[PDB]
Amino acid sequence: FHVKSGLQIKKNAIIDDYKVTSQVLGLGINGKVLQIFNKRTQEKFALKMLQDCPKARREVELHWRASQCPHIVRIVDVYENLYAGRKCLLIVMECLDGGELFSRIQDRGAFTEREASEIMKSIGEAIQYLHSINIAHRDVKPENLLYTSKRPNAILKLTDFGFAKETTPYYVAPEVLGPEKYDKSCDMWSLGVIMYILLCGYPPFYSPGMKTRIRMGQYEFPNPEWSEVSEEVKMLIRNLLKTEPTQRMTITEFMNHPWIMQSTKVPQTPLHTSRVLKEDKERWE
Amino acid sequence: FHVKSGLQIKKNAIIDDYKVTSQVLGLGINGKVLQIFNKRTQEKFALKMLQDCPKARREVELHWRASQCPHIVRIVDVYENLYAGRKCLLIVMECLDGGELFSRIQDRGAFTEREASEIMKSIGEAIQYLHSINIAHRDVKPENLLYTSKRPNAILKLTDFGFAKETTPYYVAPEVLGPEKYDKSCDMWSLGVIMYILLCGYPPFYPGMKTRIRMGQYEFPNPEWSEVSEEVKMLIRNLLKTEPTQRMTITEFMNHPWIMQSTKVPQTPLHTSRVLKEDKERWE
Amino acid sequence: FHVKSGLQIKKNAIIDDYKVTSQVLGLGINGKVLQIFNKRTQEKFALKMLQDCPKARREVELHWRASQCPHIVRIVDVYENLYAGRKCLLIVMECLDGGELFSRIQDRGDQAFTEREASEIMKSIGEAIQYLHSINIAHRDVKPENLLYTSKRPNAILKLTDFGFAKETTPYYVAPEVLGPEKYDKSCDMWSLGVIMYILLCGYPPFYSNISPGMKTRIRMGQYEFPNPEWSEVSEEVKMLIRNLLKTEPTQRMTITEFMNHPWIMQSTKVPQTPLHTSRVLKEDKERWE
Amino acid sequence: FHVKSGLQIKKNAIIDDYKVTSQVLGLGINGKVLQIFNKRTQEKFALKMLQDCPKARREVELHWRASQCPHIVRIVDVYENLYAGRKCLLIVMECLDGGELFSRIQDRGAFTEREASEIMKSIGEAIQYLHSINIAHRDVKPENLLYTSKRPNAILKLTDFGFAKETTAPEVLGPEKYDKSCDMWSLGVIMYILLCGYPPFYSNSPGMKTRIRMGQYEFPNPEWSEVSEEVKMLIRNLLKTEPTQRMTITEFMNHPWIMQSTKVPQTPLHTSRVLKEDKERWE
């Protein structure tokens, strides 16, 4: 019997409990994230500021639901305050000072196929949890993937529920148990894009003729970066980047794929990612 | 960085915390106001009783938002209780035992043009705050303006949000930033009517009244108005324009020299004080 | 920086510029195609006659857009004229006197038809569909009659014609479904390509006649085979490609990019030279081809 | 009897006639502006690229109509081409290499009240023309006001019809909402910056939005202590929050400060320096 507690929204002023600096820690889809300190404990936290409305209510509601998952940024507290005579949802979440995923990769001098498999598996776990509770994230990108600390055993966590949406006898088919459109399969594409970048350092879709190469599904595995990468992985990427949403692999199929399943039986082959990523600081702004 | 706390609705029975008398302190647009006492502190407060629904919810919501302003009656607590098996919003607000604005004026024996200016400025300040946070009051009248105490330095406060309504790159015109009808300019009219009564003791508008209002037929008759500067008459004339869009905005009003420099306004005495008691009859 | 010129509709009488014969060169979905000659140059061209309306305007518009592609019949000029007191779009296009695709196949004996050549043909049909899809146009009528050769000379280019059914189909991490709706218009060309590929390898269609209201059900069921003796030489790789274009569920069907990347199309010149029965089965079956 | 020719859209490829560089000359509301060169004449021009649709058709249409006015950027040619298999309106316009209005002001070391009057008059004239032919511009901002050359006698020109809209006793001759009066506000904002170097409505961000709807601004010293009460009164009247209280363009062109530009005091303003001294919060 597992129940977890529901969301108690605090109504007292947030400045009673926290010291709010104005150091920006990130730009969210609807409001920026600031660095704040626990007044009593001195410890550091992140504050996202949203203006109260049905949209912001849903973000909080959906994020709270997924907050239990180990690979999703944990919500510490939610405040409802008045700011310049308007209502406000203020979300306090744990501090992910390990920085973005591709910043950590970019800081070495090498990255291996087996580590890429381990990263992908933990992103997968987050998506898997979300989907299993009928939430599509709809905005899985490089900027939303942060580490808890700089210490080498930090956990990778997913952030930002600004685009998240809800997706809704005993031999009965999955279609007959509630409608459900393509919301979910759209995370599966992101997973493919991220996997591609993780293995070579650049996106599969490049520099108005980009928009058509995406709908056509025109990309490659060019050398020298991809010449070591096993055909097994190329085949998995090919299957996540299918232009037709229903041809795309589901998250359960993905977590069961042997390349993800047995992360520790994947070849230790080195990739170019680490260098290609810093060598291309320009067109990454 | 200023945040103020949001509204925490108390769910426990109000009678746990307050002794509720049935002495009526006023009749609100939707429910009367009763005198109550803080059980623990003995101190006196006012309780407004509303039946829960979308209308009442909005009154509380809007009033809470404006409650920060010094010139608007402060909400102490909001209770949600069951009363005769129906849901209830009960609002506890500070006790304004200084009485109504025109009751205080009516009790001397004289009132000056400078004091009228100081009164108008504090009412102005209330409207200015409301408008700046996009709320129109829509019911600014004599009964809704009360004083905190009888002590001569009491603050004047605005009450009753029963009619209040919400009114909705960086060089773009005010019309292109959200629609907005005449909700606000309707306060500006009340301001004119109150200013008029403050300066002479009677209203500018006396079934043929209904047409004198839409026509804009009123005067500044003697002897009351013969002392009153042309500058003030001109301000009143501009608040009482029948065409809403011709009317002065609250920012223009607060910037008007007669309001701006209250203390540079002539000390000339008005008839208000006497005309007001001398006319107790047609004020019921 | 590649811009191409837009369409200038000529308003003067077409008969100022061309001699119009009434030799029919083909029947289009909405109006026949006639043989015409450039008055000044003596050279031969084809004229398609459409009656002006939103439908005909779209045909011209879409065809013009696709006209750039090397494997789509080139539009030379468009006239807007009055014919019997009604408005008219007259389209002048290059002359494809090499004839239909299956007419050329049907005319050999001397060096038979090979699997490698079928691969080269399929690749050039694919290139036309690929271009169309990439500019968001579905052709929706890719059949044998719409595939013609520029000349009889053995190095002639194969070209696709007839836009009478053509229809328009509408940061860096965004899914293809979130960039505009789009139904099954395109995947429907992919089926044609499968049917054409099948005929190209054996000389008959995968879906038959007889009963013949029972052909309609064998199509929706997906009942067809690779019978012998024709298919016994054909590699399993090709059969697998056809199986995948002829899927009855449109979404299961291969996209044009996957098709152009398939090794059998990609490396046309690495495809076995194995001879097919197509050439003979095609003339041997002149009857039920009318 | 004055007729002017209508718009002939060229259908041939634009690269037949022009060499198209990819040096960006500005960012428009719907598509950027590029530097291009006349292949035969060698002369320089600006190319705005729009994707064909009803929106773009209207921009071209309305811009062409206003292109006659001396204070509106002149359209040279309009091409309709295929670009990556989609239709395109390409607009070729005269090259305004004098730069933006506030860049020219920012480059001296002084600006006078009389010159601000002359600038405001020429902006006024463009608006006046537009309004008289029933077109509201709806996007009169600093970035849309450019000079023809660097030469000190260059003409100031208004650009970008991406927001322009057609606007159809004076009330009984056709409806018409507040489209026009919204240009009148822009004129006030521009005039305000022209006289002191900063906008009337500040940064400090969500409380700016309310200061605009409230109409809270000032004429603070030291910048405004020299500026005549007559001008402050004109600005006050263009910045009225109520659109119908706002001055019309005809009243504006007839105001003595605009009418007699050359009878306006030569008093120097701080604009020139306040503008470079504040390069930061202007990005």
Ligand SMILES: O=C1NCCc2[nH]c(-c3ccnc(-c4cnc5ccccc5c4)c3)cc21
């Ligand atoms: O929801 C969001 N919107 C988009 C970006 C974002 N970052 C965060 C976030 C949350 C917790 N911690 C951080 C954070 C803390 N410290 C950092 C140090 C150095 C780099 C990045 C950091 C991010 C960011 C939340 C969101």
Ligand SMILES: O=C1NCCc2[nH]c(-c3ccnc(-c4cnc5ccccc5c4)c3)cc21
């Ligand atoms: O919201 C309202 N609607 C209209 C009636 C009203 N009275 C009040 C009010 C609020 C606080 N104090 C009082 C009050 C207290 N003591 C008094 C003594 C004598 C006369 C009037 C008094 C009013 C009235 C609020 C409202």
Ligand SMILES: O=C1NCCc2[nH]c(-c3ccnc(-c4cnc5ccccc5c4)c3)cc21
């Ligand atoms: O749009 C169309 N509708 C379907 C039939 C068709 N044929 C053509 C066409 C176009 C250009 N040339 C020809 C043509 C020319 N010369 C020929 C000589 C001998 C046989 C066939 C020929 C076809 C046909 C266009 C269309």
Ligand SMILES: O=C1NCCc2[nH]c(-c3ccnc(-c4cnc5ccccc5c4)c3)cc21
């Ligand atoms: O319609 C528009 N949208 C907003 C930006 C813009 N710039 C232009 C434009 C038009 C003509 N010339 C220029 C131009 C040319 N050369 C320049 C050199 C240096 C600075 C600015 C320049 C502007 C810009 C048009 C538009």
